[PDB]
Amino acid sequence: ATFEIVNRCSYTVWAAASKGDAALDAGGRQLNSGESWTINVEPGTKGGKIWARTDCYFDDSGSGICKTGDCGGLLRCKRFGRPPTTLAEFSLNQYGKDYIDISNIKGFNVPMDFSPTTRGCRGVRCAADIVGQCPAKLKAPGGGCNDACTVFQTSEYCCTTGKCGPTEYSRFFKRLCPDAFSYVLDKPTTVTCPGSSNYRVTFCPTA
């Protein structure tokens, strides 16, 4: 499957793509404002994620640091990123269908649109100014708006037992972005697409 990752932000982002235990394609790349990076994701990939990282520094060997979404200091991500990270999540060719969503469960750093480039389903978007409106206690000093589980580490926010409800914090993410997961047990906003669809992830789709 092809994913075109487009940076429409006015600032540079370092895109990342991983399935948690391995990189997807090269795993990461710098995208200056307006740049597009096309990756190939193997059919059948389950639990893949794409995210943006901000304010990165990398040396000649691809080792460094990012203020949001750092994946163990690598330019080329092999693992998931450090919150806060708005996430494009996908599972491909699962009994003939693809499943996509946007999640704020690990916080939000950059606005995103995640849409198919092929026929048969709608896209999802979370483009509200969550960082600007972020509740004081969730603001991340390095940038972004943390989820409550990251900040407070309680069974209720992290849904540790699988018995949690919405919270004042999850409702904030849900109010600004109804089409994104706001907590682990949120009413799913997953979209079913035809198996083997192709996609585009756009950072800052509106600004």
Mind giving me the DSSP string for 133-153? H--GGGB-TTSSB--HHHHH-
* Tally of structural domains, the chain: 1
Mind giving me the DSSP string for 48-107? EEEEEEBS-EE-TTSBEE-SBS--TTBSS-SSPPPSS--EEEEEEEETTEEEEEEE-TT-
* CATH code of the domain containing 120: 2.60.110.10
Q: How was this structure determined?
A: X-ray
Query: Which of 71, 63, 65, 74 minimizes the C-alpha distance to 87?
Result: 71
Helix (H, G, I), strand (E, B) or coil at 169: helix
Q: How many CA atoms lie less than 13 Å away from 114 in the CB half-sphere?
A: 26
Task: Supply the range of the domain harboring residue 182.
Answer: 1-207
Under 8 Å CB-to-CB from 58, ≥6 apart: which residues?
14, 64, 75
DSSP state of 19: -
Dihedrals phi, psi of 172, to nearest 5 degrees: -65, -50
- Letter for the amino acid at 185? L
Give the resolution to one decimal, in Å. 1.5
